Amino acid sequence: SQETFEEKYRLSPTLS
Amino acid sequence: RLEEAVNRWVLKFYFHEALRAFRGSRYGDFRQIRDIMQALLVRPLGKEHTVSRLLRVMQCLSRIEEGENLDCSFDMLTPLESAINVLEMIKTEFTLTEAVVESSRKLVKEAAVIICIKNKEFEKASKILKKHMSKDTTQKLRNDLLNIIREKNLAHPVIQNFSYETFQQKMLRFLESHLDDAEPYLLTMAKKAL
């Protein structure tokens, strides 16, 4: 739906 | 049209260098290269099937490489729990059998509990053991890990002998086995240029 390519395949952690 | 091609060349080259760094235990370099790949993901890369496989492998490795940092999240879940989710996605999208990924699923789940125990996060270890190991592995290991948690017994051999280096090198070995062998176009051209 609204999922982006960057979201689906996120490599780096959202919170670090 | 042209940017997509170069973008894929660039992604594939940096994927190659990330594996090389991970395989050499150069995790500082791995993370720097990972951040470059992350920044590339917002640019047009072509048909999603041309890059899906390498990206899933890179996702799993990135979560494993952060596996000991419980102060880090890829999903609003500890890093090794995220890696478990990516492993399931790899099983489905790579058309693998349950048996082929079983031993790897086992390594990641055991690592997820043991890292929590090593950091003395007994409650997190207990919740992970119940979430991922209840419906898969053996009851004696579940019981052993439970009792290690109840007694906070980091001296137990299951904890003492666990090696994170060995764990993540084994994980790279399994993940790599599903990738094609083509050397990245950029690396080839660099050899010819130098």
XYZ file of N, CA, C and O in Angstrom, chain B:
776
model
N 16.434 5.868 -16.773
C 16.863 4.595 -17.351
C 18.353 4.360 -17.124
O 18.775 3.259 -16.756
N 19.151 5.400 -17.377
C 20.586 5.302 -17.135
C 20.896 5.296 -15.641
O 21.767 4.543 -15.188
N 20.199 6.133 -14.862
C 20.489 6.221 -13.433
C 20.187 4.906 -12.732
O 20.935 4.478 -11.849
N 19.095 4.246 -13.120
C 18.766 2.951 -12.538
C 19.910 1.963 -12.714
O 20.301 1.271 -11.768
N 20.467 1.890 -13.923
C 21.546 0.942 -14.181
C 22.746 1.224 -13.286
O 23.238 0.331 -12.586
N 23.224 2.471 -13.278
C 24.346 2.822 -12.411
C 23.993 2.551 -10.954
O 24.788 1.978 -10.200
N 22.790 2.955 -10.535
C 22.383 2.732 -9.153
C 22.510 1.261 -8.777
O 23.041 0.923 -7.710
N 22.029 0.365 -9.643
C 22.169 -1.061 -9.358
C 23.634 -1.469 -9.329
O 24.061 -2.217 -8.440
N 24.424 -0.987 -10.292
C 25.860 -1.241 -10.236
C 26.425 -0.817 -8.890
O 27.194 -1.558 -8.264
N 26.033 0.367 -8.415
C 26.597 0.893 -7.175
C 26.157 0.043 -5.991
O 26.973 -0.352 -5.149
N 24.860 -0.257 -5.913
C 24.363 -1.117 -4.845
C 25.089 -2.456 -4.837
O 25.546 -2.922 -3.788
N 25.210 -3.087 -6.006
C 25.830 -4.407 -6.066
C 27.290 -4.348 -5.658
O 27.776 -5.234 -4.943
N 28.008 -3.309 -6.087
C 29.403 -3.197 -5.686
C 29.520 -3.066 -4.177
O 30.353 -3.732 -3.548
N 28.712 -2.187 -3.573
C 28.834 -1.995 -2.130
C 28.312 -3.202 -1.355
O 28.792 -3.478 -0.249
N 27.347 -3.937 -1.911
C 26.972 -5.214 -1.310
C 28.170 -6.147 -1.269
O 28.460 -6.762 -0.241
N 28.903 -6.227 -2.378
C 30.085 -7.078 -2.435
C 31.104 -6.682 -1.371
O 31.668 -7.543 -0.685
N 31.356 -5.376 -1.219
C 32.334 -4.928 -0.228
C 31.838 -5.126 1.199
O 32.651 -5.322 2.111
N 30.522 -5.044 1.428
C 30.000 -5.315 2.768
C 30.232 -6.776 3.161
O 30.728 -7.069 4.259
N 29.885 -7.709 2.271
C 30.174 -9.121 2.524
C 31.654 -9.335 2.800
O 32.036 -9.999 3.772
N 32.506 -8.797 1.923
C 33.944 -8.920 2.120
C 34.346 -8.420 3.502
O 35.141 -9.062 4.198
N 33.781 -7.285 3.933
C 34.117 -6.755 5.252
C 33.582 -7.661 6.357
O 34.302 -7.985 7.310
N 32.313 -8.069 6.254
C 31.745 -8.994 7.234
C 32.572 -10.275 7.304
O 32.924 -10.751 8.391
N 32.905 -10.841 6.141
C 33.667 -12.084 6.111
C 35.041 -11.916 6.760
O 35.545 -12.847 7.394
N 35.652 -10.741 6.633
C 36.902 -10.455 7.305
C 36.788 -9.958 8.731
O 37.796 -9.537 9.309
N 35.593 -9.987 9.321
C 35.372 -9.516 10.690
C 35.629 -8.016 10.837
O 35.975 -7.537 11.923
N 35.467 -7.255 9.751
C 35.671 -5.805 9.778
C 34.304 -5.126 9.872
O 33.772 -4.575 8.910
N 33.739 -5.162 11.074
C 32.353 -4.758 11.243
C 32.189 -3.246 11.217
O 31.148 -2.755 10.773
N 33.196 -2.497 11.674
C 33.156 -1.052 11.512
C 33.004 -0.658 10.058
O 32.171 0.173 9.707
N 33.798 -1.273 9.184
C 33.641 -1.024 7.756
C 32.281 -1.499 7.264
O 31.628 -0.809 6.473
N 31.838 -2.679 7.715
C 30.531 -3.176 7.294
C 29.446 -2.128 7.523
O 28.647 -1.842 6.629
N 29.410 -1.546 8.723
C 28.363 -0.579 9.054
C 28.466 0.675 8.189
O 27.448 1.206 7.733
N 29.684 1.176 7.955
C 29.823 2.339 7.083
C 29.291 2.043 5.687
O 28.602 2.873 5.090
N 29.593 0.860 5.153
C 29.109 0.514 3.820
C 27.605 0.296 3.845
O 26.893 0.673 2.906
N 27.103 -0.331 4.908
C 25.661 -0.472 5.091
C 24.954 0.883 4.993
O 23.921 1.015 4.319
N 25.505 1.912 5.646
C 24.857 3.223 5.621
C 24.836 3.805 4.224
O 23.890 4.520 3.862
N 25.858 3.515 3.421
C 25.823 3.945 2.029
C 24.699 3.236 1.287
O 23.938 3.858 0.536
N 24.565 1.926 1.493
C 23.503 1.191 0.819
C 22.136 1.692 1.257
O 21.237 1.865 0.427
N 21.973 1.962 2.555
C 20.721 2.522 3.054
C 20.338 3.788 2.287
O 19.196 3.949 1.848
N 21.291 4.702 2.117
C 21.016 5.939 1.399
C 20.654 5.682 -0.056
O 19.913 6.467 -0.657
N 21.142 4.584 -0.636
C 20.806 4.272 -2.025
C 19.371 3.794 -2.201
O 18.823 3.919 -3.302
N 18.752 3.262 -1.146
C 17.452 2.608 -1.276
C 16.341 3.558 -1.710
O 15.286 3.086 -2.146
N 16.536 4.879 -1.591
C 15.494 5.815 -2.000
C 15.606 6.192 -3.467
O 14.737 6.912 -3.982
N 16.634 5.734 -4.152
C 16.812 6.045 -5.558
C 16.248 4.928 -6.428
O 16.123 3.779 -5.990
N 15.881 5.230 -7.672
C 15.329 4.184 -8.544
C 16.373 3.114 -8.830
O 17.497 3.413 -9.237
N 15.989 1.862 -8.602
C 16.873 0.721 -8.765
C 16.395 -0.271 -9.822
O 17.026 -1.323 -9.992
N 15.308 0.022 -10.526
C 14.771 -0.903 -11.500
C 13.704 -1.807 -10.910
O 13.101 -1.531 -9.869
N 13.470 -2.916 -11.607
C 12.495 -3.887 -11.134
C 12.941 -4.463 -9.797
O 14.110 -4.811 -9.611
N 11.998 -4.558 -8.860
C 12.346 -4.983 -7.508
C 12.985 -6.366 -7.492
O 13.784 -6.668 -6.596
N 12.663 -7.221 -8.468
C 13.226 -8.567 -8.458
C 14.717 -8.580 -8.779
O 15.403 -9.544 -8.420
N 15.236 -7.541 -9.440
C 16.658 -7.510 -9.769
C 17.544 -7.331 -8.541
O 18.737 -7.659 -8.602
N 17.002 -6.825 -7.433
C 17.807 -6.519 -6.254
C 17.243 -7.132 -4.978
O 17.875 -7.027 -3.924
N 16.080 -7.779 -5.041
C 15.416 -8.243 -3.826
C 16.309 -9.190 -3.027
O 16.418 -9.076 -1.802
N 16.948 -10.137 -3.713
C 17.709 -11.181 -3.037
C 18.878 -10.607 -2.253
O 19.045 -10.898 -1.064
N 19.728 -9.818 -2.912
C 20.873 -9.269 -2.198
C 20.411 -8.410 -1.029
O 21.024 -8.432 0.042
N 19.297 -7.685 -1.199
C 18.825 -6.809 -0.130
C 18.349 -7.607 1.077
O 18.604 -7.215 2.220
N 17.649 -8.727 0.852
C 17.247 -9.556 1.987
C 18.468 -10.079 2.739
O 18.497 -10.091 3.977
N 19.488 -10.528 2.008
C 20.689 -11.030 2.668
C 21.365 -9.915 3.456
O 21.803 -10.114 4.595
N 21.439 -8.719 2.868
C 22.038 -7.580 3.562
C 21.217 -7.182 4.784
O 21.773 -6.784 5.812
N 19.889 -7.262 4.693
C 19.068 -6.974 5.865
C 19.387 -7.931 6.997
O 19.510 -7.529 8.155
N 19.472 -9.223 6.684
C 19.700 -10.201 7.733
C 21.059 -9.981 8.371
O 21.182 -9.962 9.601
N 22.086 -9.768 7.546
C 23.424 -9.508 8.068
C 23.460 -8.233 8.907
O 24.150 -8.179 9.931
N 22.746 -7.184 8.479
C 22.787 -5.936 9.238
C 22.197 -6.125 10.627
O 22.700 -5.562 11.601
N 21.125 -6.912 10.736
C 20.528 -7.166 12.043
C 21.424 -8.058 12.891
O 21.546 -7.850 14.104
N 22.073 -9.048 12.270
C 23.014 -9.887 13.006
C 24.211 -9.066 13.476
O 24.707 -9.248 14.599
N 24.709 -8.164 12.625
C 25.900 -7.410 13.013
C 25.618 -6.489 14.194
O 26.532 -6.176 14.965
N 24.372 -6.051 14.358
C 23.963 -5.265 15.514
C 23.395 -6.127 16.628
O 22.816 -5.588 17.578
N 23.543 -7.452 16.529
C 22.809 -8.346 17.408
C 23.119 -8.176 18.883
O 22.275 -8.471 19.734
N 24.330 -7.725 19.218
C 24.685 -7.559 20.624
C 24.263 -6.211 21.191
O 24.344 -6.023 22.409
N 23.817 -5.276 20.349
C 23.365 -3.961 20.810
C 21.863 -4.030 21.043
O 21.055 -3.845 20.129
N 21.476 -4.303 22.287
C 20.058 -4.281 22.616
C 19.501 -2.864 22.723
O 18.281 -2.704 22.826
N 20.354 -1.838 22.707
C 19.901 -0.444 22.651
C 19.678 0.020 21.221
O 19.959 1.172 20.880
N 19.255 -0.911 20.375
C 19.169 -0.645 18.930
C 17.945 -1.368 18.388
O 17.692 -2.451 18.832
N 17.202 -0.738 17.489
C 15.983 -1.390 16.957
C 15.818 -1.174 15.458
O 16.056 -0.087 14.970
N 15.377 -2.215 14.787
C 15.049 -2.134 13.350
C 13.525 -2.179 13.217
O 13.033 -1.954 12.127
N 12.824 -2.551 14.298
C 11.346 -2.666 14.327
C 10.794 -2.228 15.686
O 10.724 -3.092 16.542
N 10.380 -0.961 15.816
C 9.700 -0.307 16.983
C 9.777 -1.114 18.288
O 10.357 -0.602 19.246
N 11.243 -5.120 19.468
C 11.979 -6.256 18.855
C 13.490 -6.007 18.955
O 13.947 -4.948 18.567
N 14.235 -6.971 19.486
C 15.713 -6.876 19.520
C 16.254 -7.178 18.123
O 15.577 -7.831 17.357
N 17.457 -6.710 17.767
C 18.012 -6.952 16.455
C 17.996 -8.410 15.996
O 17.742 -8.630 14.877
N 18.238 -9.353 16.894
C 18.243 -10.751 16.467
C 16.833 -11.287 16.246
O 16.646 -12.221 15.461
N 15.836 -10.719 16.918
C 14.456 -11.040 16.571
C 14.119 -10.535 15.173
O 13.492 -11.248 14.385
N 14.531 -9.308 14.843
C 14.338 -8.818 13.482
C 14.993 -9.746 12.463
O 14.407 -10.037 11.415
N 16.217 -10.198 12.743
C 16.895 -11.109 11.827
C 16.096 -12.385 11.618
O 16.140 -12.972 10.532
N 15.379 -12.838 12.649
C 14.532 -14.021 12.505
C 13.424 -13.759 11.494
O 13.128 -14.594 10.629
N 12.788 -12.592 11.597
C 11.771 -12.228 10.619
C 12.339 -12.218 9.207
O 11.704 -12.726 8.276
N 13.534 -11.644 9.023
C 14.123 -11.587 7.685
C 14.452 -12.988 7.186
O 14.343 -13.281 5.987
N 14.901 -13.865 8.089
C 15.163 -15.252 7.711
C 13.899 -15.932 7.178
O 13.949 -16.665 6.181
N 12.750 -15.691 7.814
C 11.498 -16.229 7.284
C 11.236 -15.696 5.884
O 10.880 -16.453 4.968
N 11.404 -14.383 5.702
C 11.196 -13.794 4.382
C 12.118 -14.425 3.350
O 11.696 -14.708 2.221
N 13.377 -14.674 3.726
C 14.316 -15.315 2.807
C 13.850 -16.726 2.456
O 13.921 -17.154 1.297
N 13.381 -17.473 3.453
C 12.874 -18.818 3.198
C 11.775 -18.801 2.142
O 11.763 -19.621 1.218
N 10.831 -17.871 2.273
C 9.707 -17.813 1.348
C 10.139 -17.285 -0.011
O 9.865 -17.906 -1.044
N 10.830 -16.142 -0.030
C 11.147 -15.500 -1.301
C 12.225 -16.253 -2.066
O 12.262 -16.187 -3.301
N 13.133 -16.933 -1.364
C 14.166 -17.724 -2.020
C 13.681 -19.129 -2.359
O 14.460 -19.934 -2.883
N 12.424 -19.449 -2.048
C 11.849 -20.772 -2.335
C 12.673 -21.893 -1.695
O 13.092 -22.845 -2.357
N 12.907 -21.772 -0.391
C 13.675 -22.750 0.366
C 12.733 -23.625 1.185
O 11.620 -23.219 1.525
N 13.194 -24.836 1.502
C 12.439 -25.712 2.388
C 12.628 -25.284 3.840
O 13.590 -24.592 4.187
N 11.695 -25.710 4.696
C 11.873 -25.491 6.127
C 13.157 -26.143 6.611
O 13.897 -25.563 7.417
N 13.447 -27.349 6.117
C 14.629 -28.071 6.576
C 15.912 -27.326 6.235
O 16.870 -27.352 7.012
N 15.955 -26.662 5.080
C 17.183 -25.993 4.659
C 17.520 -24.825 5.581
O 18.700 -24.537 5.824
N 16.512 -24.138 6.122
C 16.772 -22.986 6.980
C 16.696 -23.328 8.462
O 16.934 -22.446 9.305
N 16.395 -24.585 8.805
C 16.149 -24.945 10.200
C 17.364 -24.654 11.073
O 17.256 -23.988 12.108
N 18.528 -25.163 10.690
C 19.677 -25.008 11.569
C 20.038 -23.543 11.734
O 20.505 -23.138 12.805
N 19.813 -22.728 10.695
C 20.084 -21.298 10.808
C 19.070 -20.614 11.711
O 19.435 -19.770 12.540
N 17.812 -21.001 11.596
C 16.760 -20.445 12.469
C 17.155 -20.755 13.914
O 17.018 -19.905 14.755
N 17.652 -21.960 14.147
C 18.058 -22.398 15.501
C 19.214 -21.541 16.031
O 19.178 -21.176 17.176
N 20.189 -21.232 15.193
C 21.346 -20.437 15.653
C 20.886 -19.044 16.087
O 21.215 -18.653 17.189
N 20.074 -18.398 15.260
C 19.624 -17.005 15.520
C 18.773 -16.964 16.792
O 19.016 -16.097 17.598
N 17.851 -17.907 16.961
C 16.982 -17.918 18.165
C 17.825 -18.127 19.421
O 17.602 -17.431 20.389
N 18.758 -19.067 19.376
C 19.604 -19.332 20.557
C 20.456 -18.092 20.832
O 20.534 -17.700 21.958
N 20.983 -17.465 19.792
C 21.796 -16.249 19.954
C 20.944 -15.134 20.560
O 21.422 -14.447 21.430
N 19.694 -15.021 20.132
C 18.814 -13.949 20.635
C 18.643 -14.074 22.149
O 18.694 -13.052 22.813
N 18.421 -15.283 22.647
C 18.253 -15.508 24.110
C 19.569 -15.311 24.868
O 19.574 -14.661 25.879
N 20.643 -15.868 24.339
C 21.962 -15.842 25.019
C 22.492 -14.412 25.147
O 23.048 -14.106 26.169
N 22.312 -13.591 24.127
C 22.773 -12.179 24.206
C 21.996 -11.472 25.318
O 22.604 -10.774 26.074
N 20.693 -11.713 25.418
C 19.901 -11.064 26.480
C 20.437 -11.525 27.832
O 20.641 -10.688 28.676
N 20.715 -12.815 27.971
C 21.236 -13.387 29.240
C 22.605 -12.782 29.563
O 22.806 -12.429 30.685
N 23.468 -12.614 28.570
C 24.830 -12.057 28.754
C 24.760 -10.620 29.279
O 25.600 -10.269 30.082
N 23.763 -9.849 28.846
C 23.537 -8.444 29.265
C 22.663 -8.393 30.524
O 22.211 -7.329 30.874
N 22.299 -9.550 31.062
C 21.496 -9.700 32.300
C 20.056 -9.213 32.111
O 19.429 -8.907 33.088
N 19.572 -9.176 30.875
C 18.187 -8.809 30.533
C 17.391 -10.111 30.563
O 17.030 -10.601 29.509
N 17.178 -10.636 31.760
C 16.509 -11.930 32.011
C 15.057 -11.881 31.555
O 14.613 -12.862 31.010
N 14.359 -10.776 31.805
C 12.942 -10.688 31.377
C 12.852 -10.715 29.853
O 11.996 -11.423 29.349
N 13.722 -9.977 29.171
C 13.727 -9.972 27.691
C 14.075 -11.380 27.203
O 13.411 -11.861 26.306
N 15.039 -12.030 27.846
C 15.447 -13.387 27.442
C 14.257 -14.332 27.573
O 14.032 -15.091 26.667
N 13.517 -14.208 28.666
C 12.342 -15.067 28.919
C 11.267 -14.837 27.856
O 10.730 -15.806 27.374
N 10.993 -13.582 27.525
C 9.936 -13.254 26.541
C 10.359 -13.764 25.169
O 9.527 -14.286 24.469
N 11.624 -13.605 24.824
C 12.115 -14.103 23.512
C 12.008 -15.632 23.471
O 11.530 -16.152 22.497
N 12.385 -16.296 24.551
C 12.362 -17.769 24.602
C 10.921 -18.253 24.429
O 10.730 -19.255 23.768
N 9.967 -17.586 25.069
C 8.537 -17.944 24.921
C 7.996 -17.599 23.527
O 7.149 -18.310 23.053
N 8.367 -16.465 22.957
C 7.804 -16.067 21.642
C 8.306 -16.927 20.472
O 7.468 -17.404 19.703
N 9.616 -17.168 20.403
C 10.234 -17.808 19.216
C 10.583 -19.271 19.429
O 10.779 -19.959 18.425
N 10.673 -19.709 20.676
C 11.077 -21.112 20.882
C 9.951 -21.992 21.437
O 10.203 -23.166 21.605
N 8.767 -21.442 21.707
C 7.631 -22.263 22.204
C 7.085 -23.221 21.148
O 6.826 -24.367 21.497
N 6.916 -22.733 19.920
C 6.313 -23.482 18.792
C 7.401 -23.710 17.759
O 7.127 -23.461 16.588
N 8.593 -23.975 18.306
C 9.947 -24.294 17.768
C 10.958 -23.273 18.271
O 11.877 -23.706 18.941
N 14.295 -25.199 20.519
C 13.548 -26.297 19.847
C 13.247 -27.441 20.812
O 12.096 -27.655 21.060
N 14.242 -28.140 21.337
C 13.876 -29.259 22.238
C 13.493 -28.760 23.627
O 13.991 -27.741 24.052
N 12.657 -29.530 24.303
C 12.174 -29.154 25.645
C 13.348 -29.062 26.629
O 13.345 -28.169 27.437
N 14.319 -29.964 26.534
C 15.454 -29.912 27.486
C 16.221 -28.596 27.322
O 16.609 -28.059 28.333
N 16.463 -28.139 26.096
C 17.186 -26.855 25.912
C 16.336 -25.701 26.439
O 16.890 -24.820 27.052
N 15.034 -25.725 26.177
C 14.117 -24.676 26.686
C 14.260 -24.632 28.210
O 14.416 -23.553 28.762
N 14.189 -25.810 28.825
C 14.254 -25.988 30.289
C 15.615 -25.509 30.775
O 15.653 -24.832 31.756
N 16.674 -25.854 30.057
C 18.029 -25.418 30.451
C 18.082 -23.890 30.412
O 18.470 -23.319 31.411
N 17.621 -23.275 29.324
C 17.697 -21.819 29.212
C 16.805 -21.138 30.240
O 17.192 -20.119 30.826
N 15.601 -21.673 30.459
C 14.731 -21.158 31.516
C 15.452 -21.148 32.859
O 15.435 -20.144 33.582
N 16.082 -22.271 33.218
C 16.717 -22.368 34.527
C 17.936 -21.464 34.611
O 18.208 -20.879 35.666
N 18.688 -21.346 33.517
C 19.771 -20.371 33.474
C 19.238 -18.977 33.780
O 19.882 -18.188 34.483
N 18.044 -18.659 33.274
C 17.462 -17.340 33.502
C 17.019 -17.197 34.953
O 17.313 -16.191 35.612
N 16.300 -18.198 35.469
C 15.804 -18.132 36.839
C 16.949 -17.989 37.831
O 16.837 -17.258 38.821
N 18.057 -18.673 37.581
C 19.209 -18.621 38.464
C 20.205 -17.538 38.076
O 21.181 -17.327 38.805
N 19.980 -16.845 36.959
C 20.907 -15.822 36.492
C 22.318 -16.395 36.408
O 23.297 -15.775 36.829
N 22.415 -17.596 35.843
C 23.639 -18.391 35.876
C 24.409 -18.188 34.574
O 24.376 -19.012 33.662
N 25.138 -17.070 34.497
C 25.953 -16.842 33.309
C 27.114 -17.819 33.211
O 27.725 -17.926 32.143
N 27.445 -18.520 34.295
C 28.531 -19.487 34.269
C 28.149 -20.792 33.584
O 29.026 -21.635 33.365
N 26.878 -20.976 33.244
C 26.457 -22.217 32.616
C 27.207 -22.410 31.299
O 27.456 -21.436 30.580
N 27.594 -23.643 30.966
C 28.372 -23.865 29.731
C 27.681 -23.381 28.466
O 28.365 -22.954 27.526
N 26.351 -23.454 28.397
C 25.654 -22.941 27.221
C 25.963 -21.463 27.017
O 26.096 -20.991 25.882
N 26.064 -20.705 28.108
C 26.412 -19.291 27.995
C 27.901 -19.123 27.729
O 28.303 -18.432 26.784
N 28.733 -19.774 28.552
C 30.179 -19.565 28.521
C 30.768 -19.855 27.152
O 31.614 -19.100 26.657
N 30.357 -20.968 26.542
C 30.933 -21.423 25.288
C 30.363 -20.714 24.067
O 30.879 -20.921 22.965
N 29.317 -19.904 24.221
C 28.726 -19.238 23.064
C 29.699 -18.209 22.502
O 30.247 -17.394 23.244
N 29.931 -18.253 21.194
C 30.818 -17.305 20.522
C 30.033 -16.540 19.470
O 29.525 -17.138 18.515
N 29.958 -15.215 19.629
C 29.202 -14.423 18.671
C 29.912 -14.356 17.326
O 29.251 -14.336 16.282
N 31.246 -14.329 17.326
C 31.981 -14.360 16.066
C 31.637 -15.611 15.262
O 31.283 -15.535 14.077
N 31.741 -16.779 15.895
C 31.400 -18.030 15.225
C 29.961 -18.010 14.727
O 29.675 -18.416 13.595
N 29.038 -17.542 15.570
C 27.637 -17.449 15.183
C 27.459 -16.626 13.912
O 26.817 -17.076 12.960
N 28.027 -15.413 13.865
C 27.731 -14.572 12.709
C 28.502 -15.004 11.465
O 28.006 -14.803 10.351
N 29.649 -15.657 11.637
C 30.385 -16.174 10.456
C 29.596 -17.352 9.871
O 29.531 -17.469 8.671
N 29.006 -18.175 10.725
C 28.159 -19.292 10.260
C 26.954 -18.724 9.509
O 26.617 -19.257 8.480
N 26.365 -17.657 10.034
C 25.191 -17.023 9.399
C 25.570 -16.465 8.032
O 24.845 -16.722 7.107
N 26.732 -15.830 7.915
C 27.197 -15.316 6.608
C 27.376 -16.495 5.643
O 26.954 -16.378 4.511
N 27.932 -17.598 6.133
C 28.187 -18.791 5.300
C 26.867 -19.298 4.723
O 26.800 -19.484 3.523
N 25.838 -19.423 5.548
C 24.526 -19.871 5.036
C 23.927 -18.862 4.055
O 23.560 -19.268 2.990
N 23.939 -17.578 4.392
C 23.261 -16.554 3.559
C 23.913 -16.437 2.184
O 23.191 -16.340 1.219
N 25.234 -16.501 2.154
C 26.041 -16.382 0.926
C 25.730 -17.521 -0.041
O 25.743 -17.268 -1.225
N 25.503 -18.715 0.487
C 25.253 -19.914 -0.342
C 24.056 -19.730 -1.278
O 23.943 -20.494 -2.211
N 23.227 -18.723 -1.059
C 22.053 -18.535 -1.902
C 22.218 -17.402 -2.901
O 21.243 -17.032 -3.564
N 23.423 -16.850 -3.033
C 23.671 -15.708 -3.898
C 24.392 -16.151 -5.166
O 25.199 -17.082 -5.143
N 24.093 -15.479 -6.276
C 24.816 -15.738 -7.510
C 26.261 -15.275 -7.369
O 26.619 -14.523 -6.459
N 27.100 -15.725 -8.291
C 28.542 -15.588 -8.139
C 29.128 -14.406 -8.903
O 30.324 -14.137 -8.771
N 28.321 -13.691 -9.680
C 28.854 -12.671 -10.572
C 29.631 -11.618 -9.794
O 29.137 -11.065 -8.809
N 30.856 -11.353 -10.233
C 31.624 -10.253 -9.663
C 30.998 -8.923 -10.079
O 30.568 -8.771 -11.229
N 30.929 -7.945 -9.177
C 30.248 -6.692 -9.517
C 30.933 -5.995 -10.682
O 32.161 -5.927 -10.759
N 30.113 -5.477 -11.598
C 30.648 -4.804 -12.774
C 31.640 -3.708 -12.390
O 32.691 -3.562 -13.029
N 31.340 -2.939 -11.336
C 32.235 -1.848 -10.952
C 33.597 -2.374 -10.518
O 34.634 -1.799 -10.870
N 33.616 -3.464 -9.751
C 34.885 -4.040 -9.319
C 35.703 -4.529 -10.510
O 36.921 -4.322 -10.566
N 35.051 -5.186 -11.469
C 35.747 -5.606 -12.681
C 36.408 -4.419 -13.364
O 37.609 -4.442 -13.662
N 35.634 -3.360 -13.613
C 36.170 -2.203 -14.316
C 37.278 -1.529 -13.520
O 38.201 -0.956 -14.108
N 37.216 -1.594 -12.190
C 38.284 -1.006 -11.389
C 39.585 -1.785 -11.558
O 40.663 -1.189 -11.669
N 39.504 -3.119 -11.582
C 40.694 -3.925 -11.835
C 41.295 -3.603 -13.198
O 42.513 -3.441 -13.325
N 40.455 -3.492 -14.228
C 40.967 -3.169 -15.555
C 41.557 -1.767 -15.603
O 42.475 -1.514 -16.390
N 41.048 -0.847 -14.780
C 41.531 0.529 -14.811
C 42.862 0.681 -14.084
O 43.757 1.383 -14.567
N 43.018 0.041 -12.929
C 44.266 0.151 -12.173
C 45.388 -0.669 -12.807
O 46.522 -0.202 -12.901
